[PDB]
Design a protein around this nucleic acid. Sequence first.
RNA 1: AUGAAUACAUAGUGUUGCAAGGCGAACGAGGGGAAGUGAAACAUCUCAGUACCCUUAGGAAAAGAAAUCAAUUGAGAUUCC
RNA 2: UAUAAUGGGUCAGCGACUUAUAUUCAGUAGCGAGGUUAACCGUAUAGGGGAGCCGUAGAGAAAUCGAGUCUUAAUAGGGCG
RNA 3: GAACCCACUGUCGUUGAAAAGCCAGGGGAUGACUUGUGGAUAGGGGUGAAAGGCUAAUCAAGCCUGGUGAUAGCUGGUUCUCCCCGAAAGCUAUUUAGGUAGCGCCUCGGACGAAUACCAUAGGGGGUAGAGCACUGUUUCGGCACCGAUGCAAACUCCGAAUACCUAUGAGUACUAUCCGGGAGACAGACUGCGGGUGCUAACGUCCGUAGUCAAGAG
RNA 4: AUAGCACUCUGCAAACACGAAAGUGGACGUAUAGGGUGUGAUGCCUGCCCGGUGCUGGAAGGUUAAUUGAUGGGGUUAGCGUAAGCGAAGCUCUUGAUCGAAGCCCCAGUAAACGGCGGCCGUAACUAUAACGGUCCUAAGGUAGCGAAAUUCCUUGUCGGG
RNA 5: GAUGCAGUGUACCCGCGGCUAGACGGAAAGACCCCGUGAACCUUUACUGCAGCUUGACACUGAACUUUGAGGUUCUAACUCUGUCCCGUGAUCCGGGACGAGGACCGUGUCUGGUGGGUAGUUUGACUGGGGCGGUCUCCUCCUAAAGAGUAACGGAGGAGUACGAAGGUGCGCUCAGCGUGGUCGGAAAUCACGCGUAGAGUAUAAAGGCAAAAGCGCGCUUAACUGCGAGACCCACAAGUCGAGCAGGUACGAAAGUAGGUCUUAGUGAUCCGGUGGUUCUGUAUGGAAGGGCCAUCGCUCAACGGAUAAAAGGUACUCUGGGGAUAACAGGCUGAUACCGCCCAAGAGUUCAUAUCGACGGCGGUGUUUGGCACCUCGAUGUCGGCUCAUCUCAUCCUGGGGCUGAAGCAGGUCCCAAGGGUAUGGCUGUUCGCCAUUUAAAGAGGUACGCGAGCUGGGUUUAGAACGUCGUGA
RNA 6: GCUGGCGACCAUAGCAAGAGUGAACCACCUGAUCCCUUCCCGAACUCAGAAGUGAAACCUCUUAGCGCUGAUGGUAGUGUGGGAUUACCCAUGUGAGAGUAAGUCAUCGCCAGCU
Lengths: 76, 51
Amino acid sequence: STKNGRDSNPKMLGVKVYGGQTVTAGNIIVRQRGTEFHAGANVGMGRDHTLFATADGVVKFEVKGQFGRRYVKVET
Amino acid sequence: MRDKIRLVSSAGTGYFYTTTKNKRTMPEKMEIKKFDPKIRQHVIFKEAKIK
RNA sequence: AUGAAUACAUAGUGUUGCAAGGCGAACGAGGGGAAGUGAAACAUCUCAGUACCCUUAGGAAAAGAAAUCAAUUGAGAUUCC
RNA sequence: UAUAAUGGGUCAGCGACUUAUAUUCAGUAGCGAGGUUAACCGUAUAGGGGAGCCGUAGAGAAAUCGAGUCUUAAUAGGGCG
RNA sequence: GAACCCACUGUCGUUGAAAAGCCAGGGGAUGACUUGUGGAUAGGGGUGAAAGGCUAAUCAAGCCUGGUGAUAGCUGGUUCUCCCCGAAAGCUAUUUAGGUAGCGCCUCGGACGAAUACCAUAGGGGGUAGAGCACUGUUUCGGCACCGAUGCAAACUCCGAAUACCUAUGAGUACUAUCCGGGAGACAGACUGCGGGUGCUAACGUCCGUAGUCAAGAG
RNA sequence: AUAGCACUCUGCAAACACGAAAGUGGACGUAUAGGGUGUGAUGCCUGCCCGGUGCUGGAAGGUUAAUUGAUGGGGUUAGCGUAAGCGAAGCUCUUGAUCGAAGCCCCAGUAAACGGCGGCCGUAACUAUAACGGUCCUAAGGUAGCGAAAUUCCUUGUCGGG
RNA sequence: GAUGCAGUGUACCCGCGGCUAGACGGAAAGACCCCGUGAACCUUUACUGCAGCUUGACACUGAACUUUGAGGUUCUAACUCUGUCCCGUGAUCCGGGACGAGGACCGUGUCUGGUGGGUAGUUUGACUGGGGCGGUCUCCUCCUAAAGAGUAACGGAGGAGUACGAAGGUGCGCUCAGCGUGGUCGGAAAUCACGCGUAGAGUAUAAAGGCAAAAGCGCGCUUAACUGCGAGACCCACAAGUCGAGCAGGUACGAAAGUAGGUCUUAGUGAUCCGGUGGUUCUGUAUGGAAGGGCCAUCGCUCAACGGAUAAAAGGUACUCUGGGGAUAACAGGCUGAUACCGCCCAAGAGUUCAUAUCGACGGCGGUGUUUGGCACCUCGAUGUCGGCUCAUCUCAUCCUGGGGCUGAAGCAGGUCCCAAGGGUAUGGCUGUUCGCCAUUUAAAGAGGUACGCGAGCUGGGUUUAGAACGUCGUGA
RNA sequence: GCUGGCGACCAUAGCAAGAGUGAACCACCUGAUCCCUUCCCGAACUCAGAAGUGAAACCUCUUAGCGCUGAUGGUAGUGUGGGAUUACCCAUGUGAGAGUAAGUCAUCGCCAGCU
């Protein structure tokens, strides 16, 4: 009899809206366990590190700053 | 583990909150300031039996 | 009419007269009364007061003239649709 | 499945999606903001019988309101319309 | 040891002469013996020197008639003709696993038309193939844990494609996409190629992903 | 199955069995009798354990039923209050004190009642063994007799006979 | 596992007597095995009732004297007699009468506690490379998983069924770990001081994704671990689950811009029904109340078989039965060849010297389809056998006989390899044996395939029905 | 041309080494009276000021030492069609990682002082 045989239910993480798409305020952009992406302009961060839009516009990804963090912002 | 307790409004409205507490570390009855929607003010709430 | 224990009686015994018993469709009234089944198992529950057993009428039976309902103070005995 | 998996020795005759009620949808006919009677009466498929049913208004657990209504301290917001 | 009552062995018989026998041997044969006639015990009951034996060729609950057309997620069967479309053997849950229910897939009616798809161009995230040793482990040889050479990794990564996926614009081609309703069937799959787990880089083996064919398709 | 043996129940309107009851068998019998249970002529015999379950006999402590209904808490309204409200009696809902048997808990006996009958290490002048000891745990750790057996896996054990 | 398909060989048409190798021959919807939320009967310290037995209260049920509500003594009149006598009456039933012995006991009705396999109805999960035994059943993390999501196995590895009134909020403030130098006890490593290089520390807890405006670490004040909501999204069969700007009220910390709707995040959980508690400008069976119900908040689950069939449930069947399955096991066939058997390559060494006369270590490559297995494709509306008997047929990896090469071949013998399938190739003791051991033979007593050849050709000793016993297991069947 | 503040950008821009700067600015600097401060300490934070020094620090310049950037070509992988099954070959499209040549001691913006 094996001592293995367990696993957890899937969580369905990942990028939900890609660069160049238009969003409405409140749209979820990234589901992530940790801050793989950071919130830029017009983007808010939830209690579970979810990134969402706070304004209408076009999503844009970039690499910026002195640490080389990945940012996602919304351009109005 | 941790026992369930009610915090009852001192204003006499009958409003209450529910929480848990460790008896061994907190033997005394708990008092804390909370909002009472019945009178729309902050008042002191006191521990009582959850029953 | 006769006639014990037992005195009076009563019980018991006999004669005469009258009546009853049995059978047969369904329907009626009453006395008893299952399980298969369903619940996707099963015990509460259901099946169902059904099947069946028993007693007993009539052309029908049962019920019936409010110690009943109703709720503007009104209706007005049973039975069936 | 040629299968060495099932069934049929052969012929003739019989042999299996029904009936009642309710409900929903589609066709078709009448009438149409209206439609329609049931039991029952009726020498009776007629003609009577409007009790009742469906539609015509929603919201709310409900009291209640009503093109609004519920929630709320709120004419804010939101849900059903 | 005959009659009578039994049934230990063997051949035969087994669509028999016989639904338990014949033949040759065998046991008891004044006893707890055998037997006629007539009675008693009735079904969760009877009777049993006890084998669950016997109770009318029937017994772990007799037979007959009723409840009764018991129930059966199981097996079988289901009858004339032509035309159009055409599946699935998956996910989720289930005292569920060969049943069923919601969704996925089929069909018919209505509404609505370019909102759809193929391809091109443009924008976007990645951590696989490969590779590497910068971390985590592991490996060999030197020099003094470190330094120099040298390998390995599904649960290592300093790196990192092709494809696939999402969005916008556009030509051409095509009855496309979507919404609201009536009716389903199906939830046992198989092989082959490619990427893998398991198995011995076994199996016409087993479990996933992906495409084709069969299933339901003849030449 | 049996004669023989043993245990146990039964004082007679017997125990026990059939039956719903009436009643019937037991038995027109009476403990030298009748029922139940086990063993199975006869010979020699029948060891230890009452912790468990059962049976028998005690004990009156703890626990417990129906019944009983002391207390406490509500509902209602005469009345009293400007009011908020208070509020007897009478009905009524509920709470439940006290009393209350057997059984059970407890204590003894009982195995021809159902049942049970163990382990780990040492030790005598050659060797070996262990008369003999060290202990742990039970209610108690197999007496007589028998033993590769209708019982023995290893196993066709080993030795003798044929 | 083919009379019927392919290729090919053979074969004029039809009887009769024989025979049983095949027609997976006929016979009985397999009895073994599994399945169905099938059946029956049996058992018990399974569940739940009932009969029977037993306890107490009330009723039938009365009287008079004593003692500390209860106990004792006496009585007769209820009631008992399967005791005697009389009568009905020609009668061991029954009824009435007279006695005698008992007697408010016994016994019966209603209620009530106990006991209760005597009897009755039922239950006793699923997954599963057959079933059983073992393991597992819900949630979180990583890999498998093929660079979006998702993705299975009784695949490979670990965690959870909590904790915290601060370990929450806010304002202000601060950086770890390691190594080296010196410094009392004091050092491998306690604390102090200065450097060096460097995220290797930490984050309540497993792992992963994260963490400088540190999400890590301190101090003061505090309760936003608030109430009403909520545009818009993620995920999704449903039921559920997740993120959320912003508006209003009341707060806390800041000088302020501001931050705060618990904790870096992802596990720490349970639907509905039925009940308890607080509140309530809802309802209230004539009316006013009330009881009860509704609404808001909240409490009672290892219902862990974790979408939870009941409030409540274990076993046996060889005495058995039905509906099904070759969807699924035991025999034989099939695929495979780990295992098995046979062969070959390299060659340390052994062989007095001498790898290869004969052996041959450590390693490597194949063949066959006699073993043990793996799979579950055929057969469960039946393919019905362990051994022996009778009768066979084929292969060659040859046991004897025949022909050869080499030799550590003097001869006689022997060893090893090659060719060769024509024929031949024991009887007995023991045991059911196949096998095996033993005795005595023979030139030799070969190894295998043929449904482990052959039971519509024979047997039936073994195995595997129903009877009985022993050892052992079980309370018991 | 020097100095200060705030940004863009985040190594071709960084580290390391060497050398320079005092008019103004900045930095050390004085001590601690009142503000304020240390789980001790005027070390930091804070106040009130210029007796000294550019020593340290910060800035500026030089160096390819460490580091970083990095072609071309080839190789690996891979979508589609075909041919094979130790995982290759062909046609077509695509194309790394490592390494080699080589490059680098950044480049811009706003405001204010001093010449």
